[PDB]
Structure formats: C-alpha cells, structure tokens
Amino acid sequence: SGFRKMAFPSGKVEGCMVQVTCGTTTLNGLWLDDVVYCPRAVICTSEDMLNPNYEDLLIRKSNHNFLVQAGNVQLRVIGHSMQNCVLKLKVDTANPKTPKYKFVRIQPGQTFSVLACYNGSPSGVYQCAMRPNFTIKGSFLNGSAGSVGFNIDYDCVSFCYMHHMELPTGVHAGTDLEGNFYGPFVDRQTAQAAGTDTTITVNVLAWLYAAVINGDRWFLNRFTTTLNDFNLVAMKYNYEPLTQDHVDILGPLSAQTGIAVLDMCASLKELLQNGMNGRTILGSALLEDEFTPFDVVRQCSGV
C-alpha cells in the first residue's frame, strides 16, 4: 500500500554527469561514450545574456576554452559543435559507465525523473510532468542547467529533458537532448512567459484509480456519463479534453478495479462540481495530475 511521487533510481544517470566550464560560466553536462552534451548557454558571457548570437560565440571558442570535469578527472575536449540549443563536446575518453540509452522527445502530460545537479554533482532526484504549456514545475537554482530528465525501461535510459532556464512564474523550461526547446521558449534572458496551462485529465483519472487500488472509495458514485458530456464539464474547469485514446490507455486500470472509465469520469465530474468537502484522496486535498496511467501501474504493481 501507499502511493508516492516516485522517481526512477538515478544511479545510471549519476555516472554520466560532468561539470562544463567556459570562463566563469559553469553548468552540468551529460557524458555518453566520448561526447558531453550541455546547454549552449555555457558559452554565453555574463554581459551578453540578453541577445547572444551563439554561432558567433561558438566560432570564437576553441577546444581548450571548455573545461570538462568528471569529478576531479579532467576530460580533454577534442572537438565541439552546436546542435540547436545544445553543444556536443567530443572528449578523448569514452565514459566507461555509459548506460544503454536513447534520446526521446516526450509529449505533454508524460512524466519523467529529474536528477538535479550542481557543478557536475547530483544533488537530488524528483518526478516532473511536462505540462500542457511545455514547462515543468521543477526545483532548480543557478548552476542547475544541464541537469537531465529521464525514464528507465529495464536497463535502457531514455533521456527526454535537459534543463536550461527559469521563467518568471518560477516554472522551468528546457530542451530535448537534440537541443530543441519544449514550448515557444528561447535560451536568452529576454521577456518570456509560460502560456496558459491546463490540467492533464487522463492523469487525474489515473490517480483516482490509484486511490481506489489503495482503498480510497468515497468519491465513487453509481452514475456514469458520456464522453461528450464529460468533455463539456472538462472544458469548463480548464481540463484537457478526454479522447477515446485516453479511455483505451486507462483500460488496464478500469479492468483491475472493475470501474468503467466513464463511471470514473462521473466521479471526476462530481469532484470538479462540488470539491472534496474536507476529505482527501491519497493524502491530497487537490486533484493530482502528475501521474500517468503507466506511473500508477508501475507503482501499484511494483515493476
């Protein structure tokens, strides 16, 4: 029993984190085989962080301008290039701890584990969802750029996020590992703002199923709704529309609990219309949308 925000074990990623320094600018890099990946913001100077021309900045650098450190072991840079908002620094040593991995671009609503790092040293691990407005609600300070988000399948690490920046509302923006930003954001300190966000409906339903699996049943009712009538209510409360594909992904959960998806949508509707009346679900007085259906199965089945 129990249901927690649970990260993947971070060991395989800790062994890939390095420190990258250019002048007085430092951040984290990801060391896979003989390539270190890091945000190109490391070549930005403190005086021109507003309008950097990174192509210019990069031409003016040489390999020896990049200080890469795996702990105390200094890694010599022997080649450099820029792909979108990430730098690829070729080093003379392949990381002997490189895991099986892939670079993937995740969709809004999917979750991943963040290994927050400073000066190349892992400091903490937590779960995040990619919000519909393409930000994440992380916990990041100066020096955290280059920390990565990932999922693990068997022993294969899927890197999906590299951290770059913080937006004015205190949420976080970054790229995939090919350097393409999630969301309409850019790696410079100009005026930028997160778009309006929405709640991930399929995840709230997943978490209601988790709640039932853990014995919370007070929010169930004998009613059912149509998908169209539910989406009518969802729009009113700024929830993403629920699609037939979402209903299908919730199948294993409905099957295990015996609660049809549209029966649970009737519970969600009542919770949206009336609130919780002082009760809690899995320890929360708010409807939680940062667990996917997959996250619930992983934790309630213990994979």
């Binding site: 945000p39 100066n142 020096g143 913080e166 004015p168 100009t190 930028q192």
Partner: peptide, 10 residues
C-alpha cells in the same frame, strides 16, 4: 520579466 538562464558562476 526576463527568463533566467540557470548556468552558474565559478
């Protein structure tokens, strides 16, 4: 507001 690039100082 402006974005903050969260590199650090050495």
């Amino acid at each position: 507001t402006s974005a903050v690039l969260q590199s650090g100082f050495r």
